[PDB]
């Protein structure tokens, strides 16, 4: 009765995919990483009395030139799409990523959510909250902003994708 879930985290490089994930899994914030390498963490969390066994696939960053498969993996239960609120490039990229992702998954009922990370960098913001929100809304996707410096916001992200998959 302990459920098993695999989540893939996608996004442009340096948006904080690894930082968010590491914050969630190990409760700490890093300043460095291995950018171009796929990393897969395991995490146990209880959500609403229900135990979940998480596999989190921290992917190598993608851009407009990254290859997306034409078919989906049945063993992946949700997708977290991450951009940085400090990078317009990361934001335009996340739209391309989403579009190719939709090509891959088709109409299958596997949730995809949108996360604008680095909300703590107040003075470097180039993407408004509204733009992220309305993008997500246009995808019928959940939206959150986050800071890998703030454990609760990282928790909220992974908690939310699990809640979407359970719908």
Ligand X SMILES: Nc1nc2c(ncn2[C@@H]2O[C@H](COP(=O)(O)OP(=O)(O)OP(=O)(O)O)[C@@H](O)[C@H]2O)c(=O)[nH]1
Q: Which two tokens stand for residue 9?
A: 């985290």
CB of 2 to Mg ion, least distance (A): 27
Cβ proximity to ligand X, 35 vs 99, nearer residue:
35
Q: Which does 96 bind (CB under 5 to 8 A by kind): ligand X, Mg ion, none?
A: none
Q: Are 134 and 95 in contact (CB under 8 A)?
A: no
Q: Measured between alpha carbons, how far is 101 from 55 in angstroms, rounded to an integer?
A: 20
φ/ψ of 28, rounded to 5, equals: -135, 160
Q: SS3 for 92?
A: helix
Residue 66 interacts with ligand X (CB under 6 A)?
no
User: Could you say which of 16, 78, 116, 132 contacts ligand X (CB under 6 A)?
Assistant: 16
Q: How many helices (H) and strands (E) does the chain have?
A: 4, 6
Q: Which two tokens stand for residue 124?
A: 């470097």
> Which range in 27-35, 49-57, 95-103, 155-163 contacts ligand X by CB under 6 A?
27-35
> Which range in 12-20, 42-50, 66-74, 128-136 contacts ligand X by CB under 6 A?
12-20
Cβ proximity to ligand X, 1 vs 31, nearer residue:
31
E strand map for 17-68: 39-47, 50-58
Q: Measured between alpha carbons, how far is 25 from 2 in angstroms, rounded to an integer?
A: 18
> Which range in 6-14, 41-49, 106-114, 157-165 contacts ligand X by CB under 6 A?
6-14
Q: Measured between alpha carbons, how far is 114 from 160 in angstroms, rounded to an integer?
A: 11
Binding residues for Mg ion, per CB under 5 A?
17-18, 58
Looking at the chain, how many residues does it have? 167
Please state the residue numbers annotated as binding site for GTP: 14-19, 30-31, 33, 35-36, 61, 117-118, 120, 148
Please state the residue numbers annotated as binding site for Mg(2+): 18, 36
Q: Which residues bind ligand X (CB under 6 A)?
A: 11, 13-19, 30-31, 33, 35, 60-61, 117-118, 120-121, 147-149
């Amino acid at each position: 009765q302990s459920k098993s879930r695999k989540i893939a985290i996608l996004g442009y490089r340096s948006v904080g995919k690894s930082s968010l994930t590491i914050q969630f899994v190990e409760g700490q914030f890093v300043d460095s990483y291995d950018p171009t390498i796929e990393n897969t963490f395991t995490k146990l969390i209880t959500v609403n009395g229900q135990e979940y066994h998480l596999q989190l696939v921290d992917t190598a960053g993608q851009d407009e030139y990254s290859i997306f498969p034409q078919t989906y993996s049945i063993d992946i239960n949700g997708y977290i799409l991450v951009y940085s609120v400090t990078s317009i490039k990361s934001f335009e990229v996340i739209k391309v990523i989403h579009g190719k992702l939709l090509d891959m998954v088709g109409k299958v009922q596997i949730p995809i959510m949108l996360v604008g990370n680095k909300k703590d960098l107040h003075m470097e913001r180039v993407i408004s909250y509204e733009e992220g929100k309305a993008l997500a809304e246009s995808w019928n996707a959940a939206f959150l902003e986050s800071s890998a410096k703030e454990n609760q916001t990282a928790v909220d992200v992974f908690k939310r994708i699990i809640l979407e998959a359970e719908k």
